[PDB]
Amino acid sequence: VQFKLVLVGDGGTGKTTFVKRHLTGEFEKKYVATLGVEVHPLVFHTNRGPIKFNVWDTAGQEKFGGLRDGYYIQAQCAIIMFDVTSRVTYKNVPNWHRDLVRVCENIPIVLCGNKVDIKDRKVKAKSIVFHRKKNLQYYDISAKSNYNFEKPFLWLARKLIGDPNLEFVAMPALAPPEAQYEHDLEVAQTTALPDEDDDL
Amino acid sequence: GAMEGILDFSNDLDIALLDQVVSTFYQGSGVQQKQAQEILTKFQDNPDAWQKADQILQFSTNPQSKFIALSILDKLITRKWKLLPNDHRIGIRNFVVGMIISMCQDDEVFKTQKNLINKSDLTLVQILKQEWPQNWPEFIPELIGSSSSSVNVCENNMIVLKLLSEEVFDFSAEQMTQAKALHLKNSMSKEFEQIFKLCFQVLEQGSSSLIVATLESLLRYLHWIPYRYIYETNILELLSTKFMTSPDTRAITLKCLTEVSNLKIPQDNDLIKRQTVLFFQNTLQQIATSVMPVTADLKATYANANGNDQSFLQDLAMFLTTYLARNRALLESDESLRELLLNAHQYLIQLSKIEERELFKTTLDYWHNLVADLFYEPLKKHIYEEICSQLRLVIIENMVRPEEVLVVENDEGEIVREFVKESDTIQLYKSEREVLVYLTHLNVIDTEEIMISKLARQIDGSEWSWHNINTLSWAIGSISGTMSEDTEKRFVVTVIKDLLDLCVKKRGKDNEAVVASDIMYVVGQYPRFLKAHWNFLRTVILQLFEFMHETHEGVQDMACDTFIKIVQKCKYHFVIQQPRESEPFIQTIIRDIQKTTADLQPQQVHTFYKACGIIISEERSVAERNRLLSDLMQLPNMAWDTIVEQSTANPTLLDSETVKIIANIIKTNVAVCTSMGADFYPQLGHIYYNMLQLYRAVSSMISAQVAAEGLIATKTPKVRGLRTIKKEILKLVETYISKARNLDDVVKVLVEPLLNAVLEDYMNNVPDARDAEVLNCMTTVVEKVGHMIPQGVILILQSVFECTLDMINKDFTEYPEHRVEFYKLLKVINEKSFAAFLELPPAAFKLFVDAICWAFKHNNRDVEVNGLQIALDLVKNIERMGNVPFANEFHKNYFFIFVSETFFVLTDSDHKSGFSKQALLLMKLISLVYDNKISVPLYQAEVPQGTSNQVYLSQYLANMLSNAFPHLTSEQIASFLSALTKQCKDLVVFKGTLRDFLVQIKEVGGDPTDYLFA
Amino acid sequence: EEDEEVLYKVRAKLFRFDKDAKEWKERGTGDCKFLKNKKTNKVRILMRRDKTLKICANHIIAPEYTLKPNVGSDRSWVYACTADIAEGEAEAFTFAIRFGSKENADKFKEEFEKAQEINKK
């Protein structure tokens, strides 16, 4: 019951961080550049049943680009990512779109403006209009704050299943079951938790 | 494993094995897909890999294999084409053309392998960019001829032309030199007449797939082609009628027609005007008859999302808004065109009702455009009276939540404080306000009537809902300013009376929260009213004070924000003694501050205090102001005084509860200082010396704790708490100095003890224990009084320069705050107190230069930008010194370092964001030599005697470039430097030459004459 | 969830300790719930992520578990869990869980221990 999703955009825009957050819930602080592509299954539970995205997280750095447009072959949907604190990333959005739609002629695509958590935004709301003529859905997002993080997938799923009333639903919770750990616990207590200045 | 064999080139390529590996990557999963992926990437990267292409195309049974083959060629063509022997060029061209021909003739292939054919076409187009027309003159005539023989070939040819037009006109700026872009554009222009003829014929002789392809090509042509091709042919009729009727062609046609609505068009041509009318008229007629009438529920349709309905409605919105924005005046004067004008707008109305935010923004942009024109252009607004009336309704009923309204409804049906700011609706609200404001002005009676009566339908309960009262309330607040004071007066009265009624009736905590949020929003939006109605104002503020005791956290928080929002505009009325009042209201607020703020969180308490400070600064009598300040600070100052005793008796504020108290005291001071600025000074005086003592004590605690517990201690709540004290102290001083009017006192009283308290502490702490805020504080200090304290500037540098540099020079990521503040500090010092750098020992001055170049290697814009600016300012600073030994020695030591380092980041493709300022800096450095502003030889007798710096610079640069980019020819390099040097006074030309160089370094065989572009 | 009484609910952020790497990684943010089975009287922790509603914690509040402090925080607990099935198959984790406030952290611990005594019966 699965769909190939290609994820494209300039290096540093937060593609891989965005996926990881969806995969495991973690926020990866470090920038480790993707090498070619990284494929990752990602399931969502919906009122129309479960939907499976096979996420192809591609490299943004030219030098690490691997097969490039080769990755887009038979993609069924896409996400174009930019960084609202980096104007050049937005400038490049038409280049990523061009390369993408040349291979994938008729697919639903979300434009995403990442890193809106950052105080000093550079790509103004007002400027973001590229999506209009190209029939892309647009969302301000933050992989760090989780602001609108679910939106691209909810939309894509509505489009691909052909049901605008599709919702994410709660996966039924099966009843859970009923000594080196002492060393391991200590290490954990004494390792500080990140972002202690967050609201949660 | 088995798969790795394709990487061994000494053996023949096992095609079957290739296909397995490709299949494994595309259709596999897990570890095997990953391995396959790596193999294919390696294969692809092999610079001989292209030699295998023909073979793969021939014997492969796997389309993805062939795709990858083509990507390999593409890379070859785009980067090393001219490096190849002539035979290999022809050979590649032939099997590419041949493949395309062959795939187009087999119907099944043509039908089922569209991706491969497309990839093939693009690959051809790449060959053209290199070879066409100079070495392929007949390609267009042969393309045209071939088209007549087959529907498949013809259709494919359109794909090729589309791609060509894209590559040449739409995407060439970043990918080609100015000269090459001009060459290809010209070439396409010179042959378009025949291209168009083919395009037109096909469109008249109406195969749908062919027609669609042809139309897609047209969309691209429309970007650049002369207008006469559009207007002096029958093509407009075809697009606006024939191609609108069938849905297979409608989408593209509409997009073509949108582009047409943007063509280059004579303003005084009656006939062309007529045609621009006709195509609109036709198009709207087809919509009405073939798609949906003007009365249709587009909101419903969109929401159902059948077929391609959403994209169609999107494209329609785009068509209508683009056209009308440009041409609506053509429909405004002729009576016979009125219906059409209004119908067009009625469609837009219907479109505006759709629940899609991005789409709504598109239409909202148009409305704004309309209304702004109706506001100024005479005899126009009456035409649109009905449209506008309907529009008022749409907007009022779709007002998005203002940033100020802190309550929202949860999934459980509960009205609660928002978790986060709805950052994505800020701009939407503004835009909605703007349009609505304009609409109100256009007809104030209608707007008021709509609102008053909607509000009535809430009271009596007929239309009552949270959504409905909210949107209304928001709309009401948003039109503040639109009315005359007098009308506004009456208007506001009616509204408040009703909201008050509504409050009385709608009980329960959820309802109450909603009605509260809305009343606060409205009242905060109408200060003018408030200023005129003291009794009312007073009663509002007291009610806000009650809300400060609300258990409902949303209401409470909003009460604080509204209080300050109100004060920000009405502060004057709080500071004077009102008629029939015993005291100025500020007195009353201060007296009862402990009560009022009892249930507030500290940050809210601070906001409250900040607000009071705004009021107090209205009092311009010094004696009376200082007295109010004193009164306001009474509680924090007494808490303070008692702590200063206990603390000085025994440094063991180890108690965490005391730590929070201290922090909040200082935070309160910060809050008041922020609003009072220069007026804060007497209060600053009360606490200053003890504050700096406290800074010292806390600093010792932190260090003691680190010593006793290790670096981990810095993560503990205790130590974080202690640092907060230090940070807030630094903040208070920063805030005050940034606003100070009396600089003499800052220097004489504030600065020496500050420096004494903070510099050595920063210097002598371990890296992890150092506050970036010190750097930030120091920047403000240098910024404001740096000129007056040259020795102090020295002291700052000595204390923070090297030790900070050593923190941030191992990588680009660690200590990100320090990094940013460090370069802001150096920036301001370089600007305001350059002498401080002159006094540095040579070793340190070298580090400074290093520090600068390290800055522009950051991708981090915050660091990068300051890096470049410093470099530029530094050069200016040196230049300004004139022919003196320091300036001389500087150039001898560092000129080329700056030149080379700037070139490096220009050329590495990892610093694209800094291009402009990089260019500027480079231009300055070159111009310095070009203008003989360097008194000494930049060489040493490594070159002949009396050799100009001009001649040497070129030599240095050629050699540098030659070695850095060995694939370039000597003439390419020479040509490039000639252009660049000659152009060192014209930044825009100079930048163009730089860009041209960036293109040429990515390929082989770049034409040196390209640098003659002019 | 149908056959279960909600004894306690608090908004939390949950972390798991990666041992291989030497770091805490976030596992989810949302409502952490204490659920009591009406039929077995057993009490579990059930936490789901916001928006996605994906389960990030699903384990019995075992009597043997102990809430320990973290060196970095006064509003968090850490404890070793031996049977969490959020990801699917039963797995051992060292969890950390942070709250909006110290009050909230303290209220959780108390409830946590009350639940433990229930699971004892």
Ligand SMILES: *[C@H](CC(=O)O)[C@H](C)[C@@H](O)/C=C/C(=C\[C@H](C)C/C=C/C(C)=C/[C@@H](C)C(=O)[C@@H](C)[C@H](O)[C@@H](C)C/C(C)=C/C(=O)O)CC
């Ligand atoms: C529910 C109230 C309830 O149960 O009755 C809501 C949530 C209230 O808690 C919120 C109240 C707020 C503001 C009020 C608007 C402030 C009260 C003002 C008031 C009664 C002022 C008096 C002095 C008037 O002037 C009255 C008598 C007069 O009728 C006014 C309202 C009209 C005017 C000003 C006529 C004029 O010409 O001046 C939340 C901020």
Ligand SMILES: Nc1nc2c(ncn2[C@@H]2O[C@H](COP(=O)(O)OP(=O)(O)NP(=O)(O)O)[C@@H](O)[C@H]2O)c(=O)[nH]1
């Ligand atoms: N502040 C903030 N940082 C983010 C956000 N998303 C990602 N980042 C940060 O941005 C950096 C790059 O993230 P990454 O996922 O590698 O981006 P990428 O597009 O995959 N890069 P590449 O294309 O090279 O693989 C990381 O330091 C990451 O922590 C966000 O929403 N906010």
Ligand SMILES: [Cl-]
């Ligand atoms: Cl293919």
Ligand SMILES: [Cl-]
């Ligand atoms: Cl005022």
Ligand SMILES: [Cl-]
């Ligand atoms: Cl040469």
Ligand SMILES: [Mg+2]
């Ligand atoms: Mg990545």
